[PDB]
Amino acid sequence: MLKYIIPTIMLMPLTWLSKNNMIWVNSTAHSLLISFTSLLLMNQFGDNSLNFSLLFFSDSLSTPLLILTMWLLPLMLMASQHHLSKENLTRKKLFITMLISLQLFLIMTFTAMELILFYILFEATLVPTLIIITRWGNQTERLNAGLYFLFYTLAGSLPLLVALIYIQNTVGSLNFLMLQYWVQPVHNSWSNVFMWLACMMAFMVKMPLYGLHLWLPKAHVEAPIAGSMVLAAVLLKLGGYGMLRITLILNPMTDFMAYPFIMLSLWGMIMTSSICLRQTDLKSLIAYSSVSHMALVIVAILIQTPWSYMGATALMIAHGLTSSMLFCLANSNYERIHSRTMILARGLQTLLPLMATWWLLASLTNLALPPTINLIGELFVVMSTFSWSNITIILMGVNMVITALYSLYMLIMTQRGKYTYHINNISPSFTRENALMSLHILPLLLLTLNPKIILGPLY
Amino acid sequence: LRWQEDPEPEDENLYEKNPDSHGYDKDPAVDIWNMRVVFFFGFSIVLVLGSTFVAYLPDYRMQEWARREAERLVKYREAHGLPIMESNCFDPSKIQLPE
Amino acid sequence: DSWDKDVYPEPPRRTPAPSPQTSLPNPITYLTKAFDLLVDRPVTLVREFIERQHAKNKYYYYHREFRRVPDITECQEKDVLCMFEAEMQWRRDYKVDQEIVNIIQERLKACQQREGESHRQNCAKELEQFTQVVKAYQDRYHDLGAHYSARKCLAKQKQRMLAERKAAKEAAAA
Amino acid sequence: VRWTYARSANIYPNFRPNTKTSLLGALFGIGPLVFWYYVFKTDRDRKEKLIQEGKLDRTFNISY
Amino acid sequence: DKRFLKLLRFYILLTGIPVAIGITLINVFIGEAELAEIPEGYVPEHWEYFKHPISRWIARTFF
Amino acid sequence: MMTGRQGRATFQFLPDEARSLPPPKLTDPRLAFVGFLGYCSGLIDNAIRRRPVLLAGLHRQLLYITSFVFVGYYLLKRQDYMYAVRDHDMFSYIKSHPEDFPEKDKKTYGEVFEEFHPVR
Amino acid sequence: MNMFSSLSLVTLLLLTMPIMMMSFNTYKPSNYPLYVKTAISYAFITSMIPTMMFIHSGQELIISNWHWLTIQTLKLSLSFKMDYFSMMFIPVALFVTWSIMEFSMWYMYSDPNINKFFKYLLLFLITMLILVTANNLFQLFIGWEGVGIMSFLLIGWWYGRADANTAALQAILYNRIGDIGFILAMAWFLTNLNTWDLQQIFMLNPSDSNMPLIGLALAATGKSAQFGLHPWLPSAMEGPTPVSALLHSSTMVVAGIFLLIRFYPLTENNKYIQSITLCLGAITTLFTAMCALTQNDIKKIIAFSTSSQLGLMMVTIGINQPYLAFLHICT
Amino acid sequence: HITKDMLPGPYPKTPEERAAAAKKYNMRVEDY
Amino acid sequence: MNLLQVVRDHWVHVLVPMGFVFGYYLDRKNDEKLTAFRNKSLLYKRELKPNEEVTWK
């Protein structure tokens, strides 16, 4: 993975040694090249994963997440140019350095072959994320958002550190390839009940699991646009990715420990989807939609079936491009009216005709219109949960109805109707804004032509 | 006042000083080149060549080979009267049951 | 020709001969002639031209063959090197067996369409072959979970064998 | 600006853990979770018994 | 809005047309590979197990 | 643990027996990271005193890198020595207590019984 | 077969050309309504050739041209079913769509977005032909959900009107509640038959089909506006009159009935469902007809008339007459 | 700019605060 | 100008490309340390060709 780690590190000298007026151009161009070379990870086999060395390996699960992660860095740089224009040059270059550090930690996180190495990198993503929220957020609440995002993750991650170190002392290794062959069943005892909680609580808080999600509406809303994009597109998927790996060494105890979390997620789906029906803040409505979409991922991972795993991987990638697109669309309005209230600016389809087309496509993907990969992932998770218990179709069905109501309510409330009379600074959409949306939705739809590359190892 | 603080600066319309602005930068020369790198590397290289690269992957995860192999086995097994698929994955001649 | 007919059987094609009993011309007969002249002939010329170039630069690709290696039953406990090769073998077989079920399903689907309204009686052999391959596939690969492995499949097999041996005794109990 | 603040940030400081709010949060918050747990545990316990007994039709069920 | 769509169209066709033309020429004048049995004593290279010319080039050069 | 090791050679940075081990290669990845820390120290020295960060005091920056690499090289010789001594003690103890480390009888998965837990 | 297959796909491909030309701007504006109307005309004549070949000798075929995805033992391929209920509906839909597009050139002449209107009317027609020709449930779900989205975008055509958006979202709400049944049927078939292809579903012919058929009936309840999920169809008269004539009168609200017709091989062996569909249709044909007796809006009278006839279509499915229900769709 | 003095606060107890609330919400104290 | 102000403000456009070349090289050196089973596995072991000296590098 040194062919990707080293070029990412070299994005830092490039930013710092570039001309003052070329920092965005240089960093954007070379981050798109690193994204281009990420396609070489697609050299996957039907039996064995890519095992590069003693430290890093890539399989069909980490590869789509790696490609998504490296694709978002250029998009984050585009989305941040406007609101950082009136910023000190050194502080503009420190903002980019935090984004590059976040990618550096993420690419090493998804390919780490040893669980403790995964833990350190999984935990190191907090520092740059915390700094982006608290330093370059706009409102007062960014300080409290950072504290919630920080202490929710460490309250669950620290017990995971003890559990991992305990596993190495008893099994002898934490290399993920070794665990595939040396794994042993988990006898049902009170000691193993808490090894299960310690091995899964960190990932569920980061998903997030309903009830432990209170950090997400704060952090995802108060962060700058680049922070929100990475927060919702790649950093929620560290929890899902971890559970996919860690669940290998928790059988059979997962078949009864999963009930309290399958119940929280299934019922959390309906609660979080319902909250969106009454959200006054547009950016907050999008934040709660992630909680409802990651509820399906938790359920799929916990019921442990080939179809649920295939759906989970497609959902994480599909949700990554859609939620990220929605935040950029919402930030497009904010940069004109400088308010997050959804009902402030209305009828925007009569003033920004083309940006209303992106709203439509971003809304259709969010409500899982077939055959988008959003529907493929969601459908695969409904099929698997039906076999688990036929009654689940009721809860899955109700969430689909609510999802369409708050997806189109957002579209109707902000785009249709009469325009607000006293808002007269709605300038025509920039080429930067339009190209930012096209870089979200076009890959999201092209994947429908070749879905297999995002269906995960179980394919 | 409660302190000496600058007034909230009014937002700047990028189209006022540059009606050809692409939105990337205030300098027109920098603005144009930022638009060119995003469109060439974003759309001409990554989305067009990346899509073409993916379309011609060398049998991603060996699913064409699997179909080709299964055709031989179905042909071979049927030509010899063997079951199309056995219900035991491992030959029970080398399995020792508990008791 | 392009595909083997032993793995994808196609019954003989019995086409009734024309027997018109009317004076009006058959529109399909004249449209067929127009289609052949306007559509089928120019299409063939393009293909023949393309087919001619391929012969000038003919090259070959081969079908990868994997030699058998000791299966998981012959690996010592916690022996990664031997378990590794057994596991990668069980995965390839798992994939091949998945495609075998696909083939028999295609036979069942193609038979039902081909026989029209008499598929109930005329596709009884395809239905039976699909009910046996499905039984075999379900025995060796069902309920394994997302983290399936050769070990779990072996454990599943040994649980079925114990159940069958425990059934032989209770059968020969009189 | 008063409406959005009243709906988001002014809610908690004007909340008191009394009988009305505690019972409403108990039966709307915990109630559905307990209700669904027994609907699914009973459903899966019943299903598992049939599968072990071998009297649940899974003839063509090879996708899970 | 119209300027963006013109730029978007131009840059997709900047490499879309050369790639579309290139794929057409390859399929005609180079064509695919024919399935053949492995000659005795001959060990195929890992990129000779794929049919299409482009796929064999990706495997030979990158994988 | 190893403070009272019989051949400890107390209060010696590198005992003589440590000269039987391969010295760290001067291109060692660990030794290069230590040199990189020296470069960062040089840059931070300029930054806190408001000097041109990359250019000022090249002589001072060189001595930062040299000092880290020099100390790092010896701290890696002792790191390798102490792990060499651990393994040496670990194996000699096993070889002198064979009854405490007996080879267990390995069986094959066709013999050992593992319970199957269906996922349905 | 060489001509039956080629001309059966040219119809579908012909309709997508105007959509493609309006993407890469390989056409001229102000002729687009005429361009789209002419595409439907040629799509109608080509679609009559395969229909005649069916009328002549009853020829049918299934085209599985593209292999899209293989989920272990489930192979999903783009499949088109050219059979009795595809060679008779496509000609009728194109003939009716031909008139409505010509009528729209005059009715929507002064609309500034007449070009987008004819792109949406065409997109709906494509999603309806995908639904009608679908040989597997997933592809059927693409046109099933696509028609609902194009209905949403056409009901709220005059998006500045508050009552237009409310009617548009109301149609989605009732059709989503119907999609719960569609998802239920897909789940049951996969777990119990390991297929979404109609061929294998009919070949295995499940005996205990109360659950999948109840899901299909619920899906038909919403999209065909039967009692319980009926109100959206009368309120879909917010859109321009051409939309009501094409979508919500003749060629979209029949999708629910069409779905149940396609599964007559199951419903003919299940008298429990026939009781439900017969009673569901009977109440619909009465209640909506009784509503029309006192409505003063001319468009709502014809709207409730459609619900009444849709009810009579489901009464036909309840008495085990799937081919009379289909013939009533065409007429 | 908007200050804490014109943002919703706790329930008003004394009649002095009720008038302040009414003046803050642009309602007449009889209508508040 | 010529080789001045076009090599002082564009030389940085080799750092990321050079990082890829350097990163590619190290991965090749990493495989050289994992050759304990080259042409020695039960599934791919075979006799070397007359000129071939290593099955893979």
Ligand SMILES: [Zn+2]
């Ligand atoms: Zn602004």
